[PDB]
Amino acid sequence: FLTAVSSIDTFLPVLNEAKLQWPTSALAASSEELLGGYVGSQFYLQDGKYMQFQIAGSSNRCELRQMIPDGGSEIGWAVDDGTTHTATSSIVVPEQVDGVEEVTIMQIHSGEAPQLRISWIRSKSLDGVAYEDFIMSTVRIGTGDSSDNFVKTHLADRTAGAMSFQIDVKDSKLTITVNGNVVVNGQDLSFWDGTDSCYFKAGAYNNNPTSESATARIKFAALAWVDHHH
Ligand SMILES: O=C(O)[C@H]1O[C@@H](O[C@H]2[C@H](O)[C@H](O)[C@H](O[C@H]3[C@H](O)[C@H](O)[C@@H](O)O[C@@H]3C(=O)O)O[C@@H]2C(=O)O)[C@@H](O)[C@@H](O)[C@@H]1O
Ligand SMILES: O=C(O)[C@H]1O[C@@H](O[C@H]2[C@H](O)[C@H](O)[C@H](O[C@H]3[C@H](O)[C@H](O)[C@H](O)O[C@@H]3C(=O)O)O[C@H]2C(=O)O)[C@@H](O)[C@@H](O)[C@@H]1O
Ligand SMILES: [Cl-]
Ligand SMILES: [Cl-]
Ligand SMILES: [Cl-]
Ligand SMILES: [Cl-]
Known part of the structure; x- marks a missing residue:
């Protein structure tokens, strides 16, 4: 049987601050259900250690x-809220x-x-x-479809081992740190000033596959939203 992600302590903080969407943006499991042992092939504990999404x-x-947090509703914040x-x-x-091309x-x-x-x-080039x-x-700097609406950056070659990421947004600027660097x-996010509906996501979201049957798979060793206000 598949072991639930909540069966260890590692992911409990983020699970208390998230809902699971699967296989679309429809609700698969509320925060409460996640903390209560929700599990399936799409979302289970791998190796006793990884929150795995498929x-x-x-x-x-x-x-x-x-x-x-604590059973609350969908969050919304702004890049320029300070x-x-x-x-x-x-x-x-x-x-x-x-068949999996982008995750x-x-x-x-x-x-x-x-x-x-x-x-x-x-x-990709x-x-x-x-x-x-x-x-x-x-990064989107506009809502249009032309390349000038995007800033696209190579972050790192994929590694077999765990890779750490951090995303920070403050005062309409974005920083991404990969393996500590x-x-x-x-990066300027000021196009989005005043948009008060932003939120974080993480897991596996499958983009432009060439086979709709092909199963994307991603293992998280750690995930958190870090509150600077405590
Ligand atoms: O090599 C390129 O730069 C190609 O860019 C293509 O435009 C991208 C765009 O940069 C962006 O990645 C976008 O991402 C969408 C995503 O795939 C999902 O559909 C959803 O998350 O919405 C995203 C979004 O709209 O921002 O998708 C397109 C893309 O087609 O992959 C093309 O212009 C391509 O011709 C060009 O070579
Ligand atoms: O195009 C998508 O799939 C985008 O879906 C986004 O999630 C939305 C979406 O509306 C989704 O159906 C669900 O909506 C809920 C939500 O509770 C909302 O606040 C409203 O009050 O009720 C809706 C409902 O009853 O279904 O959740 C959404 C959300 O913002 O969480 C995101 O997953 C996008 O990433 C995605 O592009
Ligand atoms: Cl398991
Ligand atoms: Cl193990
Ligand atoms: Cl995120
Ligand atoms: Cl895989």
Whole structure:
């Protein structure tokens, strides 16, 4: 039988501050249900150690969505509210099966758009350089479809071992730290000033697969939203 993520202590803080969306953005498990042992092949404890997410299908997800703690409703914050908003993780991204092309593993999202996606991607060229099997950041600086609406950055080549991530937003600026090194330093998010519906997400969100049957799989060794106000 599949062991539940809540059976160890590692993820209890974030589970108290998240709902699980699966296989779409529909509710799969409330925070209370997650803390109460919700489990399935899409969301279970791997190796007694990893919160593992799995999903197949284009634009499908198995993803935690930040909630107000202690049974609260959906959170919404703003990049320019003056507070530092922080998400941390330690992620083992396994080799992805054929047909999986891009897996979003952390986000800042709002009511209408992704401000940031951190994603694994099989193969892509950025600013004239081809990259394979790597972790990328995609920041939106507008809602249009043309490339000038995005800033897309190679963060790191995928590693077999755990990779640490931290996302910080303060005063309309974004920093991303990977394995302890700042890779995105103060990216401008001021396009989003006044949008009060932002929130963190993390898990597996499957983008542009070439087979809808192919199952994306992502293992979290750690995940938290870090409250600077205590
Ligand atoms: O190599 C390129 O830069 C290609 O960029 C493509 O545009 C991307 C865009 O950068 C962004 O990644 C976007 O991401 C969407 C995501 O796939 C999901 O649909 C959902 O999360 O919404 C995201 C969003 O709309 O921000 O998807 C497109 C994409 O097609 O992958 C293209 O312009 C491509 O031609 C170009 O080579
Ligand atoms: O296009 C998507 O799939 C986006 O869905 C986003 O989640 C929304 C979405 O509306 C979803 O159905 C669900 O909506 C709830 C929620 O409680 C909401 O606050 C409302 O009051 O009730 C809705 C309901 O009854 O279904 O949750 C959403 C949310 O913001 O959490 C995100 O998953 C996006 O990332 C995604 O692009
Ligand atoms: Cl298990
Ligand atoms: Cl083990
Ligand atoms: Cl995999
Ligand atoms: Cl996140």
